[PDB]
Amino acid sequence: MELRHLRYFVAVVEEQSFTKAADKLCIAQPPLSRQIQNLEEELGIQLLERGSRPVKTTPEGHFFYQYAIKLLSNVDQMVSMTKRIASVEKTIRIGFVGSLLFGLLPRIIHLYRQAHPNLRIELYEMGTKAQTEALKEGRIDAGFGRLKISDPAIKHTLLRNERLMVAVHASHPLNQMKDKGVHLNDLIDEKILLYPSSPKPNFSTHVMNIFSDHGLEPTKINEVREVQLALGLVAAGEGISLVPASTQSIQLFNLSYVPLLDPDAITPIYIAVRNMEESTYIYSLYETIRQIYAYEGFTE
Amino acid sequence: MELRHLRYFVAVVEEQSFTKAADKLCIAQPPLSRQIQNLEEELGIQLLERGSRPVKTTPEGHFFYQYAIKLLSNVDQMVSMTKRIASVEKTIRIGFVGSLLFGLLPRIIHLYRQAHPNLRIELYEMGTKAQTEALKEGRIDAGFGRLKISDPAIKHTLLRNERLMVAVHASHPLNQMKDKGVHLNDLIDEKILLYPSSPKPNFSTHVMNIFSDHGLEPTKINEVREVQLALGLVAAGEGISLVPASTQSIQLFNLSYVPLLDPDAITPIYIAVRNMEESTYIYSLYETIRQIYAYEGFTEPPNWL
Numbered sequence: 354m355e356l357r358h359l360r361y362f363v364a365v366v367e368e369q370s371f372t373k374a375a376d377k378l379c380i381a382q383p384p385l386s387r388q389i390q391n392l393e394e395e396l397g398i399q400l401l402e403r404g405s406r407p408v409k410t411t412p413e414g415h416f417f418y419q420y421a422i423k424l425l426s427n428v429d430q431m432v433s434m435t436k437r438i439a440s441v442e443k444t445i446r447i448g449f450v451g452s453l454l455f456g457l458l459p460r461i462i463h464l465y466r467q468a469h470p471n472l473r474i475e476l477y478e479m480g481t482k483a484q485t486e487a488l489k490e491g492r493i494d495a496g497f498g499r500l501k502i503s504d505p506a507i508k509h510t511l512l513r514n515e516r517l518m519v520a521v522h523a524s525h526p527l528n529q530m531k532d533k534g535v536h537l538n539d540l541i542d543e544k545i546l547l548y549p550s551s552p553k554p555n556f557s558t559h560v561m562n563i564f565s566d567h568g569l570e571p572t573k574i575n576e577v578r579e580v581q582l583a584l585g586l587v588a589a590g591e592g593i594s595l596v597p598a599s600t601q602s603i604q605l606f607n608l609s610y611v612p613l614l615d616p617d618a619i620t621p622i623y624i625a626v627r628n629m630e631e632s633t634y635i636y637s638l639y640e641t642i643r644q645i646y647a648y649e650g651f652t653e
Numbered sequence: 654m655e656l657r658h659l660r661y662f663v664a665v666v667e668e669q670s671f672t673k674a675a676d677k678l679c680i681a682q683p684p685l686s687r688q689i690q691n692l693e694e695e696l697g698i699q700l701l702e703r704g705s706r707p708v709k710t711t712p713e714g715h716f717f718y719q720y721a722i723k724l725l726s727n728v729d730q731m732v733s734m735t736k737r738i739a740s741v742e743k744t745i746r747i748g749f750v751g752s753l754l755f756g757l758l759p760r761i762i763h764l765y766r767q768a769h770p771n772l773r774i775e776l777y778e779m780g781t782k783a784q785t786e787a788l789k790e791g792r793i794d795a796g797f798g799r800l801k802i803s804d805p806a807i808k809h810t811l812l813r814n815e816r817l818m819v820a821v822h823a824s825h826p827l828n829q830m831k832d833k834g835v836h837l838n839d840l841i842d843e844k845i846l847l848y849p850s851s852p853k854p855n856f857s858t859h860v861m862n863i864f865s866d867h868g869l870e871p872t873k874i875n876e877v878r879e880v881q882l883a884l885g886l887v888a889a890g891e892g893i894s895l896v897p898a899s900t901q902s903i904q905l906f907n908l909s910y911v912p913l914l915d916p917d918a919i920t921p922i923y924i925a926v927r928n929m930e931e932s933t934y935i936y937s938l939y940e941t942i943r944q945i946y947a948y949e950g951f952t953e954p955p956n957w958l
């Protein structure tokens with residue numbers, strides 16, 4: 354078949370008539386019907402319900418239609434992307450901490466891909482310290498993390514203040530405050546599961562920092578390997594855990610998330626680049642972030 | 654006898670029923686009638702003509718009733734009167750951490766004082782944790798500190814972000830950077846003097862928080878008793894220290910204060926009050942803070958009114 358067949362079919366489904374679609378396609382109705390008849394026989398499948406006056410699709414017709422608008426949209430994308438390629442083949446390398454996979458970062462990267470069709474993008478999971486060294490050595494070009502950096506060779510900027518939340522078993526008394534929220538102070542005597550167990554500093558450093566900023570130091574603490582351990586163990590009755598809000602991407606039976614009322618019970622997200630960085634590719638990454646944030650209704 | 658006896662008797666006389674009086678006093682019938690009996694047997698006279706409904710007094714009981722209600726009334730007046738002659742002098746109690754003595758706090762208090770000449774102002778040196786408990790128990794009315802509070806019964810408000818500075822001996826290599834400043838990262842392998850040694854959390858807890866916020870954990874740390882010890886030992890060649898910028902009120906020979914380039918190398922100042930605080934005395938304290946800040950060229954903290 355040809356793209357003509359797909360375009361002819363889609364117009365008929367959208368206009369809901371053989372003659373009405375012919376007007377927008379600028380052709381006569383007899384040959385338009387033949388093409389669709391030729392498409393159906395070439396497929397050996399009935400796509401349109403015959404013979405409806407306001408034409409309706411069959412089960413396979415509806416399926417083929419949704420596929421077709423997507424395939425024809427890909428052609429449009431192909432053409433548009435080809436005309437905006439960078440002549441010199443570039444690679445951009447991005448470091449990130451694992452917790453960022455649960456929020457906006459992936460769709461930011463995906464959007465970034467589309468802005469530079471021929472750009473090779475390499476993604477590396479690394480902590481903040483590793484990010485700092487990699488940047489200075491030029492092994493990454495941007496790092497996304499949750500900790501501030503002290504280093505004259507690095508420029509870090511606050512992107513957003515994500516809220517912290519408490520993961521609890523549904524039967525925990527604190528789950529009564531699911532819609533109201535609680536204070537860090539309410540958590541002082543709980544069994545608290547910190548994570549990950551990876552090289553420090555990491556997210557568990559931050560959580561304990563947050564308690565410490567409020568004059569608090571929990572003593573019933575257990576460090577577990579990764580987020581899923583923390584949440585799985587909470588779901589199994591082992592205690593509670595503090596998580597970034599986006600970790601709600603994980604929902605488990607009898608696991609519940611409770612908001613925190615302390616204004617500074619937060620986990621900031623930063624972008625780190627080299628101090629003297631001015632690559633258009635990195636400015637473009639910043640704008641992609643801004644684009645996504647705007648769609649989400651963020652400032653900040 | 655006790656006042657209880659009088660209240661029980663008065664109730665039976667006034668209701669003319671042991672049941673109606675029992676339901677008025679929120680007690681069972683038996684104790685009511687036994688207690689009156691104890692009174693009657695103690696005084697040696699019959700006060701009530703029991704057996705007859707409605708319940709009425711003897712001649713003796715009728716007289717006793719009149720003295721009893723007056724006596725009970727007199728007791729209530731005694732208590733009310735005693736509450737009246739209790740001190741009319743208003744006292745405001747203010748908690749603060751010692752490091753704030755080097756900055757704007759004393760002049761804020763002095764100005765506050767001038768605004769309220771008949772007010773007793775009491776000042777107590779205490780840490781954020783003790784402040785929090787003192788506020789909840791009403792032992793202070795406002796607390797000034799350098800740490801956030803997590804307690805639903807307390808409201809804390811950021812007043813200003815004070816810069817941290819590095820205190821060094823004048824011959825330290827870091828002091829070659831006095832004009833430009835240095836980074837927290839530059840201090841990681843130095844001998845750092847933390848203070849004070851008073852109950853945690855305190856200023857040393859905050860300094861190490863600042864480091865930890867920036868992924869740093871200095872290992873050459875020595876806790877000393879007080880700020881002057883820290884600065885004195887620096888001046889003596891024992892290491893370096895991190896101080897609030899206002900601590901520059903203390904100047905020692907060959908002691909040099911070096912700026913930090915990290916934007917978040919700061920030590921915030923907070924006022925803490927009870928969650929539902931609305932006393933004009935405290936609003937006035939708060940306005941005094943804003944007036945002093947405006948005079949100093951500091952950004953004013955947000956409006957109360």
Ligand SMILES: [Cl-]
Pocket residue numbers: 456457458515599
């Ligand atoms: Cl996010």
Ligand SMILES: [Cl-]
Pocket residue numbers: 756757758899922
């Ligand atoms: Cl000050």
